[PDB]
């Protein structure tokens, strides 16, 4: 039998996610000490971002940007920093350079979205802006999602040196010279990395919850689960799967009774 209508059951939350407190921050951080904010228990509107024409880069990797308002997410993050305009191409799975080697490394099996826009109006003084730093020398590469803050003289292969620059005793960091008469590609861009894990779920977008329809071959969506079955009443008790590695029970997320799933 063909499915009759659609069923949508999301929890009754009404708070919205703090994307204003991430995107519209007054001052970001430098890339060697990049900021982080864990987002949970809200309703996320990814329709007010891809419709904005301000963002000059909106990549997504494990998901398309149109199909973001339909999935429920686990472990959302946000990573804010300021880089130079010709290094946004390094913020990607598997790149090389000086940002994807000593500063900020993304894993290979990455599921998320990279957003980056231009902020020359806010990050360029008259004499110059010399306090956005990046790491230039390190002994070895980084593991994925590894932070490293240290102001110590990078001893190369010579006689050691103790808080003193000298012969092969370089400084570790380096400041970008953001003055506003730079060409594009030397201007301060400004990057946010949204990373999330798919498939306990908390964050998902504004879909309206329908009512409950029993003993009919319907299409259902219980907080993330798609399928086609017949909903009945259960006996004893989320995600309720059996020996066939398939879901055949589900707790209703708005009233705590247990439902079954019988295939049509």
């Amino acid at each position, epitope marked *: 039998v063909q499915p009759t209508e659609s069923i949508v059951r999301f929890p009754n939350i009404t708070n919205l996610c703090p994307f204003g407190e991430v995107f519209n921050a007054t001052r970001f951080a430098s890339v060697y000490a990049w900021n982080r904010k864990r987002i949970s228990n809200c309703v996320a509107d990814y329709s007010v971002l891809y419709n904005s024409a301000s963002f000059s880069t909106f990549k997504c990797y494990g998901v398309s940007p149109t199909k973001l308002n339909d999935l429920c997410f686990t472990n959302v993050y946000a990573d804010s920093f300021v880089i130079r305009g010709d290094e946004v191409r390094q913020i990607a799975p598997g790149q090389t350079g000086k940002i994807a080697d000593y500063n900020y490394k993304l894993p290979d099996d990455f599921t998320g979205c990279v957003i980056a826009w231009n902020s020359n109006n806010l990050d360029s003084k008259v*004499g110059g802006n*010399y306090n956005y730093l990046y790491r230039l020398f390190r002994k070895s590469n980084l593991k994925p999602f590894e932070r490293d803050i240290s102001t110590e003289i990078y001893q190369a292969g010579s006689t050691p040196c103790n*808080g003193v620059e*000298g012969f*092969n005793c370089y*400084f*570790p960091l380096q*400041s970008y010279g953001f*003055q506003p008469t730079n060409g594009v590609g030397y201007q301060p861009y400004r990057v946010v990395v949204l990373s999330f894990e798919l498939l306990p779920a908390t964050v998902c977008g504004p879909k309206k919850s329908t009512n409950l329809v029993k003993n009919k071959c319907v299409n259902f969506n219980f907080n993330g689960l798609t399928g086609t079955g017949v909903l009945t009443e259960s006996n004893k008790k989320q995600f309720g799967r059996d020996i066939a590695d398939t879901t055949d029970a589900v707790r209703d997320p708005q009233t705590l009774e247990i439902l079954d799933i019988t295939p049509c």
Partner: antibody
Framework: QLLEQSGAEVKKPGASVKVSCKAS?????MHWVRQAPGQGLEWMGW????????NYAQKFQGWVTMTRDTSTVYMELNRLRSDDTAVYYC?????????????????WGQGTTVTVSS | LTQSPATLSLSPGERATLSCRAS??????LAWYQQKPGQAPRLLIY???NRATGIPARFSGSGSGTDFTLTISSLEPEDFAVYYC??????????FGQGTRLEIKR
């Protein structure tokens, strides 16, 4: 800022001499640069005022020793010779914690004349 | 460091142009200083093009790579002194230059 010097003083060959540089202006180094008469400038060393970590030039390893307290910074030179007659300047340097500082030595003291004669 | 020429002669109203010559890399910031006889020196330019506070609009340096210039547009009678270039790096941490003297012609 405002930096003050000790004053002119005359010594003997083989004696010691100690120069001060007060700083009445509350993350910056202190440099010491010397100028022999009718000559160019010449760097001696820097001292961090808080942690007291110092770096000296290659030419002055063994003859110069810079101290501090808490500001007022002291530079002391021993084993004087006929080639240590100069004027001594102290110079402030704004710093960035971690990288090389792009600002130059903007505030200079007025100078301390040291005469070494027999 | 190596400046050229050794002495330079102009008249009030001319356009001064003098050059330094720095070393290895791009982490090698450079500045310009002015000294009158019997004074202490004075910052003019830092990072080869950025004027310090209080310096008028006629002092303006440029240059990149291993060649740096300072250029004065209109020469005043109060701008006759000795000029220095000063690098900032790791292995020699300062290394001042040698000096270029500026003077009046009649």
């Amino acid at each position: 800022q405002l930096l003050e010097q000790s004053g002119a003083e005359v010594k003997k060959p083989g004696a010691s001499v100690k120069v001060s540089c007060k700083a009445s202006g509350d993350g910056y180094y202190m440099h010491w640069v010397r100028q022999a008469p009718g000559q160019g400038l010449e760097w001696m060393g820097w001292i961090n005022p808080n942690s007291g970590v110092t770096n000296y030039a290659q030419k002055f390893q063994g003859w110069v020793t810079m101290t501090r307290d808490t500001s007022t910074v002291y530079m002391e030179l021993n084993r004087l010779r006929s080639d240590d007659t100069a004027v001594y300047y102290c110079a402030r340097e704004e710093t960035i914690v971690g990288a090389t500082p792009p600002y130059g030595l903007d505030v200079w003291g007025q100078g301390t004349t040291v005469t070494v004669s027999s | 460091l190596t400046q050229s020429p050794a002495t330079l002669s102009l008249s009030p109203g001319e356009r001064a142009t003098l050059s330094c010559r720095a070393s290895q890399s791009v982490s090698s910031y450079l500045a310009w200083y002015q000294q009158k006889p019997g004074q202490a020196p004075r910052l003019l330019i830092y990072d080869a093009s950025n004027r310090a506070t209080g310096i008028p609009a006629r002092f303006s340096g440029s240059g990149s790579g291993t060649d740096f210039t300072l250029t004065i547009s209109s020469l005043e009678p109060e701008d006759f002194a000795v000029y220095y270039c000063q690098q900032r790096s790791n292995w020699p941490p300062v290394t001042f230059g040698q000096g270029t003297r500026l003077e009046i012609k009649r």
